[PDB]
Design a protein around this ligand. Structure first.
Ligand code: AU3
Ligand code: AU3
Ligand code: AU3
Ligand code: AU3
Ligand code: AU3
Ligand code: AU3
Ligand code: AU3
Ligand code: AU3
Ligand code: AU3
Ligand code: AU3
Ligand code: AU3
Ligand code: AU3
Ligand code: AU3
Ligand code: AU3
Ligand code: AU3
Ligand code: AU3
Ligand code: AU3
Ligand code: AU3
Ligand code: AU3
Ligand code: AU3
Ligand code: AU3
Ligand code: AU3
Ligand code: AU3
Ligand code: AU3
Lengths: 173, 173, 173, 173
């Protein structure tokens, strides 16, 4: 093969697509982060939050690529589509966008799981379970918690609420 | 006995009942804590507050059980009734529920004191005085202080106030 | 949801039931422990053994509750039924009761696995596999080993055997 | 007085009697200890156990005497009657004698409590509660536990059982 064993072409292709989705997510977080770094937005904790996520998504893509080679599949790259927005609105708007994005990654993981199970590829299933599935669940829970707190704050009064959330919940210098 | 001395059947039974009340209190705090851990509630400091109290009430029950055996009484366990609510409302609602619960434990301690005094059981009285009575008074004072602060904050505006109390008064990561 | 994804109502309910089973197990171990602390039983190592298990079962329940919220399910609590006995007999009687209890928890885990697999919920399966299944297998093996040793000892002569097992196998001060 | 306040002659006398009882207990433990040091008895752990108790009872007497002077009472000493036996039999015989002795001290403490309460002497009650009542309860519990273990062992077979208890339960070099 010289190493490929029990690794379907279907899974190989799906893994390449998942790499693209993770890299696109990383790119979206890069855009989110720099938006919050604008002098007319200026929420450092929010920038920091999304910058860390950009790194996390890139790391996920890299782990997938490492696994592709470990199994004897061939990494193939496609264009990275630009993020869906150029401007990201308020903190709740951005957190909602983030949750939508993570749910889409999670669904792709679940779809790849289903394919792995169909193809009887337990190494793939173990890989997703060990490095991806719980990471996504934890992240989405954190995002939901954040969204609840931001919504509670901006419903009281928006400017003040956004400031307090960035200062008191998010990590900043 | 071989060890039982000056330990009435009345006190023995009352101690078993008090164990049940402390364990039920622990269970109520477990429910309170996880309620505040919900993604649609998301007040970590409040969860932490009640989680610590769950541990404290369990420890109280365990001390009572240790004492039961020290005196040569027989520990007897009954069902632990589920907590009185499945959902606990707002931070002030939960703090009020907590104060009601602690006052009920305190009254049970006082009732056991009265029984001890009636039965001329100074070891029991010393035990309650040394490990329970002041702990309850201190806890109830803290709860009252908390309730006053939360009420002051949510009367200004509720969402904002609940967030600020959780961030600035309660212990969180 | 705002976070719930691929999490069936069937699994949500089963998780609540499993929390109840773990808490009931914890309660049974609390009773076992204090029984061995009786002055007319007086086997400290046995008390210590069951006290540690009470903590372990409570921790299991708490992990399940954390997961319930991570997935966006709603924790619901029911009564904790009192343990099945008030007095627990000899060390072998108690160890047998413990094995029966652990096998019942293990079967509940396996049943939840089956449900997870039926519902195509790999996060649930990963969770059970990572935090529960091997813990149960290890514990049951230890219990079986203990039971074999106690049986070997009490068949030689009971009082002496029970003492030696508590002194030389079990952890004590 | 120049210092005596709220300290009845009844309590003063009872305290002197209690000093005598504690010193007599100390003397009994001295005899118990040296009995187990006999070459034809030779149970070092048992000797050590009773030697420590002799010290504890003497310390109790000394605390009582200190309190007598703190309150402005006059310490008065009487003969210390020799212990009730010259030879103390087997380990269970000795442990039974010890429990009888401690129960008698505990009853004397309780009687002094009753007198204190009758005389409205809260300093006396606090003193007994803080330094004596729980110490006695703890000691008697330990003795009961010991007796249960020794009885379990000597009912299997006496010589072997006595050796094992001294080696594996009691503190020795
Ligand atoms: Au940035
Ligand atoms: Au920045
Ligand atoms: Au930044
Ligand atoms: Au799979
Ligand atoms: Au598979
Ligand atoms: Au956020
Ligand atoms: Au909590
Ligand atoms: Au929490
Ligand atoms: Au918490
Ligand atoms: Au009292
Ligand atoms: Au009293
Ligand atoms: Au509070
Ligand atoms: Au125990
Ligand atoms: Au114990
Ligand atoms: Au123990
Ligand atoms: Au499964
Ligand atoms: Au599954
Ligand atoms: Au065992
Ligand atoms: Au000696
Ligand atoms: Au010696
Ligand atoms: Au010695
Ligand atoms: Au008194
Ligand atoms: Au008094
Ligand atoms: Au002894």
């Amino acid at each position: 093969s010289q190493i490929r064993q029990n690794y379907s072409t279907e899974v190989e292709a799906a893994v390449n697509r998942l790499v693209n989705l993770y890299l696109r997510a990383s790119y979206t977080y890069l855009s989110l982060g720099f938006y919050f770094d604008r002098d007319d937005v200026a929420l450092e904790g929010v920038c920091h939050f999304f910058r860390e996520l950009a790194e996390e998504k890139r790391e996920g893509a890299e782990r997938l690529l490492k696994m592709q080679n470990q199994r004897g599949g061939r990494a193939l790259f496609q264009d990275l589509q630009k993020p869906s927005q150029d401007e990201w609105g308020t903190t709740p708007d951005a957190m909602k966008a983030a949750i939508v994005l993570e749910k889409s990654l999670n669904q792709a993981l679940l779809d790849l799981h289903a394919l792995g199970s169909a193809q009887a590829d337990p190494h793939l299933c173990d890989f997703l379970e060990s490095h991806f599935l719980d990471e996504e669940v934890k992240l989405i829970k954190k995002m939901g918690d954040h969204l609840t707190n931001i919504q509670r704050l901006v419903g009281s009064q928006a400017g003040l609420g956004e400031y307090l959330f960035e200062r008191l919940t998010l990590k900043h210098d």
